[PDB]
Write a protein that binds this ligand. Structure first.
Ligand SMILES: Cc1cc2nc(CCc3nc(N4CCCC4)n(C)n3)nn2c(CCc2nc(N3CCCC3)n(C)n2)n1
Ligand SMILES: [Mg+2]
Ligand SMILES: [Zn+2]
Length: 313
């Protein structure tokens, strides 16, 4: 009832910043999430006993893969927390409620393989979900966890508010399919420039929340250089494993997933920052000015990758 979550002074201060790293102590990650819901949504958005039971079932349904794990879930939720706190008045009570949960749930039961590998392996999930294969599975896993006894954190919502929050979370999670990002951003770019962009148009909010989701999902490129560099090692540990599995099926993997092309990583990051990250945070800064630190940090890390190529590190 009268039970605030607080963090040590360094975390209390640094959690408000976009570049915050949630640290290596796994047991504090749920406290960090609850702290962010309480400050973002209020201490009355969720029954605490249900929230905690939901957090812990979500954690149990993330796998011990090198990158798409529980640490990624909480990292992506913290970046969303940063966006919501810096754009307070632009978002509804339901969006605040829905989006932090969407972020925590957005990679539920990830196996460390691309939609691509599922489809070439002919995994059952590829027959059930022809596109956004894992992303439809992640939403499906969220609904399952919500339907466990004592886990419905949305129990107090109306029949209609419930359906609205589940629809926000579905679109939010689907948008983390980076194949849907390129089209989504180009459309947001055009609408912002021509002046058509209107935040009262529900299908416009959808695109903007979609871009936020991509921004939070890629936020590894917006961290302090040593965090950015070390997260890159984890990201390639998955991709190269998937490459290995591609070769087991008789398929040359793309360079991104070929451990034989280690040497080319720095150049691969350049391409990725220029084709994906920089455009993402550019369009997001334009639409939501207070997100500029993500763009600024992304540019700094690109510049650190340029230095890696030039032998300067
Ligand atoms: C820090 C960081 C974050 C990151 N996120 C992702 C997502 C990958 C992705 N998924 C999709 N889709 C989804 C369905 C179809 C399209 N797309 C479009 N992209 N890659 N990634 C990389 C590797 C970048 C890279 N590294 C090389 N190098 C090749 C040679 C050495 C490494 N390249 C090319 N790119 N580093
Ligand atoms: Mg994902
Ligand atoms: Zn993710």
């Amino acid at each position: 009832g009268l039970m605030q979550f607080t963090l040590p002074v360094r975390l209390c201060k640094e959690i408000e910043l976009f570049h915050f790293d949630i640290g290596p102590f796994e047991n504090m990650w749920p406290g960090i999430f609850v702290y962010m819901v309480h400050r973002s949504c209020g201490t009355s958005c969720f029954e605490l006993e249900k929230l905690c039971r939901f957090i812990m079932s979500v954690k149990k349904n993330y796998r011990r893969v090198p990158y798409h794990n529980w640490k990624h879930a909480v990292t992506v939720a913290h970046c969303m927390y940063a966006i919501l706190q810096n754009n307070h008045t632009l978002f509804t009570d339901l969006e605040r409620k829905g989006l932090l949960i969407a972020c925590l749930c957005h990679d539920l039961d990830h196996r460390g393989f691309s939609n691509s590998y599922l489809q070439k392996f002919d995994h059952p999930l590829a027959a059930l979900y022809s596109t956004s294969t894992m992303e439809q599975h992640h939403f499906s896993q969220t609904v399952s966890i919500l339907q466990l006894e004592g886990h419905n954190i949305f129990s107090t919502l109306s029949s209609s508010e419930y359906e609205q929050v589940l629809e926000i979370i579905r679109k939010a999670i689907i948008a983390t399919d980076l194949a849907l990002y390129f089209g989504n951003r180009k459309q947001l770019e055009e609408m912002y420039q021509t002046g058509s962009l209107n935040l009262n148009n529900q299908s416009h909010r959808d695109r903007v929340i979609g871009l936020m989701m991509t921004a939070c999902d890629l936020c590894s490129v917006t961290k302090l250089w040593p965090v950015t560099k070390l997260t890159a090692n984890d990201i390639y540990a998955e991709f190269w494993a998937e490459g290995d599995e591609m070769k087991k099926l008789g398929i040359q993997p793309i360079p991104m997933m070929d451990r034989d092309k280690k040497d080319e990583v720095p150049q691969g990051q350049l391409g990725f920052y220029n084709a994906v990250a920089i455009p993402c945070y550019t369009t997001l800064t334009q639409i939501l000015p207070p997100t500029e630190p993500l763009l600024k940090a992304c540019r700094d890390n690109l510049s650190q990758w340029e230095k890696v190529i030039r032998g300067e590190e």
